[PDB]
Amino acid sequence: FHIATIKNISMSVEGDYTYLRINFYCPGSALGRNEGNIFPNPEATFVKEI
DNA sequence: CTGTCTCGTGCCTGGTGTCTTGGGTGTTTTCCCCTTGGCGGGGGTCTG
């Protein structure tokens, strides 16, 4: 995935395990100065979180 | 009939709130430094 696809990332430690979340851009989540970045096909499936 | 104000969504975007960073400024924290901690023979002098 290109770094542009990723919207942000977060990391958490739970003593026994560590969780790393990665959020991409998608319709509805393109908040802020990225609104003008209209996706080429907003009707497709967007992977929003991993 | 009738249409203008209102409730109730979608949509989105722009405006709210706050991490993050830098500077000013007082305060502890170590190290360094200064002050401190047996025997005898004489002599003379004073009191009675």
Curated annotation (Swiss-Prot):
Domain of life of the source: Eukaryota
Tissue: Ubiquitous.
Localization in the cell: Nucleus; Chromosome
Post-translation changes: ADP-ribosylated. ADP-ribosylation by PARP1 is induced by genotoxic stress and correlates with dissociation of FACT from chromatin.
Disease the record associates with this protein: Neurodevelopmental disorder with dysmorphic facies and thin corpus callosum: An autosomal dominant disorder characterized by global developmental delay, impaired intellectual development with poor or absent speech and language, and autistic-like behaviors. Corpus callosum anomalies are visible on brain imaging. Most patients have dysmorphic features including tall forehead, down-slanting palpebral fissures, ear anomalies and broad nasal bridge. Other variably present clinical features include seizures, sleeping difficulties and precocious puberty.
Family: Belongs to the peptidase M24 family. SPT16 subfamily.
The protein's role, per its UniProt record: Component of the FACT complex, a general chromatin factor that acts to reorganize nucleosomes. The FACT complex is involved in multiple processes that require DNA as a template such as mRNA elongation, DNA replication and DNA repair. During transcription elongation the FACT complex acts as a histone chaperone that both destabilizes and restores nucleosomal structure.
Record remark on domains: The C-terminal Glu-rich acidic region is essential for FACT activity.
The protein's assembly and partners: Interacts with MYOG (via C-terminal region). Component of the FACT complex, a stable heterodimer of SSRP1 and SUPT16H. Also a component of a CK2-SPT16-SSRP1 complex which forms following UV irradiation, composed of SSRP1, SUPT16H, CSNK2A1, CSNK2A2 and CSNK2B. Interacts with NEK9. Binds to histone H2A-H2B. Identified in a centromere complex containing histones H2A, H2B and H4, and at least CENPA, CENPB, CENPC, CENPT, CENPN, HJURP, SUPT16H, SSRP1 and RSF1. Interacts with GTF2E2.
Protein name, entry field: FACT complex subunit SPT16
